[PDB]
Amino acid sequence: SVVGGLGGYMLGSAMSRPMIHFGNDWEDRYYRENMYRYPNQVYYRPVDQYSNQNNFVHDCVNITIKQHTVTTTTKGENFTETDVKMMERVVEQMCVTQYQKESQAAADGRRSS
């Protein structure tokens, strides 16, 4: 068992829903129709072995957007580029906070910070 079949990733716990405003008329309703479908939790690898938060977020969004995209079509969840491009944001806003929770016992000290 490795968080669902990953290269040594882990899973925190259920996050908040962000407030994403694409400025649109369809995207706002799109977002409001899948706000609870979207992955309330995000996968990550340990910030200890990162450089910046950037790469961490790159792959913490991306690995969520592979895992939650494949392992959810069991319920018929069929996230196209349209849902994926929302997840890129949704999971980013969550993942920023995620690093602020995992860095705590990892890179909270050891970022000279």
Swiss-Prot record:
Residues glycosylated per entry: N62, N78
PTM characteristics: N-glycosylated.
Tissue expression remark: Highly expressed in the brain, lung, kidney and heart. Expressed at low levels in the liver and spleen.
Disulphide bridges: C60-C95
Residue numbers with lipid attached (GPI-anchor amidated serine): S112
Knockout-associated phenotype: No visible phenotype. Mice develop chronic demyelinating polyneuropathy after 60 weeks. Mice show abnormally low iron levels throughout the body, and are mildly anemic. Iron accumulates in duodenum enterocytes, suggesting impaired transport from the intestine to the blood. Mice deficient for both Prnd and Prnp have the same phenotype as mice lacking Prnd; they are born at the expected Mendelian rate and appear grossly normal and healthy. Females are fertile, but males deficient for both Prnd and Prnp are sterile, in spite of normal mating behavior.
Subcellular location: Cell membrane; Golgi apparatus
Disease: Found in high quantity in the brain of humans and animals infected with degenerative neurological diseases such as kuru, Creutzfeldt-Jakob disease (CJD), Gerstmann-Straussler syndrome (GSS), scrapie, bovine spongiform encephalopathy (BSE), transmissible mink encephalopathy (TME), etc.
Protein family per UniProt: Belongs to the prion family.
Protein's job: Its primary physiological function is unclear. May play a role in neuronal development and synaptic plasticity. May be required for neuronal myelin sheath maintenance. May promote myelin homeostasis through acting as an agonist for ADGRG6 receptor. May play a role in iron uptake and iron homeostasis. Soluble oligomers are toxic to cultured neuroblastoma cells and induce apoptosis (in vitro). Association with GPC1 (via its heparan sulfate chains) targets PRNP to lipid rafts. Also provides Cu(2+) or Zn(2+) for the ascorbate-mediated GPC1 deaminase degradation of its heparan sulfate side chains.
Domain statement: The normal, monomeric form has a mainly alpha-helical structure. The disease-associated, protease-resistant form forms amyloid fibrils containing a cross-beta spine, formed by a steric zipper of superposed beta-strands. Disease mutations may favor intermolecular contacts via short beta strands, and may thereby trigger oligomerization.
Subunit-structure text: Monomer and homodimer. Has a tendency to aggregate into amyloid fibrils containing a cross-beta spine, formed by a steric zipper of superposed beta-strands. Soluble oligomers may represent an intermediate stage on the path to fibril formation. Copper binding may promote oligomerization. Interacts with GRB2, APP, ERI3/PRNPIP and SYN1. Mislocalized cytosolically exposed PrP interacts with MGRN1; this interaction alters MGRN1 subcellular location and causes lysosomal enlargement. Interacts with APP. Interacts with KIAA1191. Interacts with ADGRG6.
Name this protein carries in UniProt: Major prion protein
Biological source species: Mus musculus (Mouse)
Phylogenetic classification of the source organism: Eukaryota, Metazoa, Chordata, Craniata, Vertebrata
Full-length numbering of the shown residues: 120 to 231 of 254
